[PDB]
Amino acid sequence: IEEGKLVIWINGDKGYNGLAEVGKKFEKDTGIKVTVEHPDKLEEKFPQVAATGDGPDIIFWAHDRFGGYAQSGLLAEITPAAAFQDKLYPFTWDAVRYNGKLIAYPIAVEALSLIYNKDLLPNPPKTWEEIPALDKELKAKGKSALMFNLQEPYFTWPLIAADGGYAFKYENGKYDIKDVGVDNAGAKAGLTFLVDLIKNKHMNADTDYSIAEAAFNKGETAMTINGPWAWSNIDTSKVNYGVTVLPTFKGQPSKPFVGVLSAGINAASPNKELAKEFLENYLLTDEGLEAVNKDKPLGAVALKSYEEELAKDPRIAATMENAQKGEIMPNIPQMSAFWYAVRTAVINAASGRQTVDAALAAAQTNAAAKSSAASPAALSGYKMTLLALIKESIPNQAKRQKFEMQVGGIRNEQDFKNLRREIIRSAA
Ligand SMILES: OC[C@H]1O[C@H](O[C@H]2[C@H](O)[C@@H](O)[C@@H](O)O[C@@H]2CO)[C@H](O)[C@@H](O)[C@@H]1O
Ligand SMILES: O=S(=O)(O)CCN1CCN(CCS(=O)(=O)O)CC1
Ligand SMILES: O=S(=O)(O)CCN1CCN(CCS(=O)(=O)O)CC1
Ligand SMILES: O=S(=O)(O)CCN1CCN(CCS(=O)(=O)O)CC1
Ligand code: PRO
């Protein structure tokens, strides 16, 4: 990583040209060059490259991936003053707290909504159960009721969760990674409803992000499910669209997993102060968020001063109604295993090559912790050993804060040995 410049990674569905404009302003004002990139699969590439001390100075993703990055030692603790923290909503800071430490700057709150074509469907269905009948009517007019991305479990989760599916059981502020909720009666009911839609030819198992976006924006389908980043392309499409609450299932709200788009600082970056400068004083300003939002809408931004304006938009009100019906995702390391397992279950069941029950049974075990935990007594001994070692051997306070955060998340002797090695390898 090159000292004296910033390299920033952000997903290709976000307002990266807008962010590059913020980068250009930073360079104009400070002399420091900013390069924005949008690599494919960056949520998988970041851990790969950062593990060897490489990669971007700043990484943007929803917060759910960030506990894994932090636990792996890839993220510095961020250092905003209390005065800066007060400029963002408290509920957003909780999404980016890991083992007591702030690990990223929250940018914006993302929840899926039902997006509908008002010309085809002036009053969109309140319930999932209404959709088959609606699709039959629209099929007789050469249209379809609903198309959305069936390849990414983010989009199907709101239906799986509606009647009781859950990721990890959450009690007394803690997630139990041995207690997974993807093959309970509610998860089965929701995924069965989706698979039935496909069986009855109301949806196609092959539908992906591009296929659904193209169909909605051409007026071929009456409804889609998507986030605020999608509104830009609909605005130029001519479709007269609305954004509303997701349909209920078995009388229960759809419960989207809510993401907070967040910006973390690579632990190996020699540019941590520049990164803080850019994020606090350029990006998290009304002007900076406007530039990104104008490119692709962010959703409900974390910066109070700008959200006061955006919240007046009915599309943002709908976003936040859906967010309130769902749940802020956990940020725990096990989230990537969860998402891979649910991805597999939905694709395999939707393709008809496996039953819903078998798909979700496999996912239930595949999402859960694979390795055993140490006993409570042994684990406390390992943690106290490492805390002593960090204080003994690591002179830099920021580096100590990072390692102390990682200590909080070890689960077994192998984790203890792995983290001990990382501490012993710490450079000056
Ligand atoms: O599908 C699983 C995927 O869900 C979320 O990714 C969202 C992301 O949060 C949105 O900002 C947008 O980019 O759509 C993605 C869905 O394709 C999780 O954040 C991600 O970790 C998980 O793999
Ligand atoms: O929060 S409490 O601990 O009080 C009850 C939590 N508990 C979780 C599991 N679901 C099963 C739904 S179903 O999938 O079986 O319908 C019921 C509610
Ligand atoms: O935060 S980063 O990881 O990017 C680099 C932080 N780094 C720590 C060490 N000090 C030495 C001050 S001096 O006495 O050498 O001037 C410079 C700043
Ligand atoms: O020192 S402490 O009492 O806290 C725990 C020491 N204890 C030694 C035995 N191994 C068994 C795993 S294995 O070696 O059989 O793989 C677990 C850890
Ligand atoms: O949800 C709505 O109704 C907004 C109004 C303009 C475009 N869609």
Author numbering: 2 to 370, 1329 to 1387
What's the publication's text?
As in the prior crystallographic analysis, each of these proteins was fused to a non-cleavable, modified MBP tag, optimized for crystallization. For one of these proteins (MBP-P329–388), crystals were obtained in multiple conditions and used for crystallographic structure determination. X-ray diffraction data were collected to ~1.3 Å resolution for crystal form one (space group P21; two molecules in the asymmetric unit) and 1.55 Å resolution for crystal form two (space group P212121; one molecule in the asymmetric unit). The structures were determined by the method of molecular replacement, providing a total of three instances of the molecule. In each case, helix α1 of the BD is N-terminally extended beyond Ser339, the previously identified N-terminal residue of the domain. Helix α1 is capped at its N-terminus by Pro335, which orients the preceding residues (329–334) such that they form a clasp or latch that runs across the top of the three-helix bundle. Superimposition of the three molecular models shows that this latch is equivalently positioned in each case with only minor variation in the side-chain hydrogen bonding that mediates formation of the latch. In particular, Arg370 and Asn371, located within the loop connecting helices α2 and α3 of the BD, interact with Ser330 and Ser331 in the latch sequence, through their side chain guanidinium and carboxamide groups. The electron density associated with the residues within the latch is unambiguous, but relatively weak, and this is reflected in the atomic displacement parameters of the structural models. In all cases, the main chain isotropic B-factors of residues within the latch are significantly higher than values in the bordering helices of MBP and the BD, suggesting that the structure is quite dynamic.
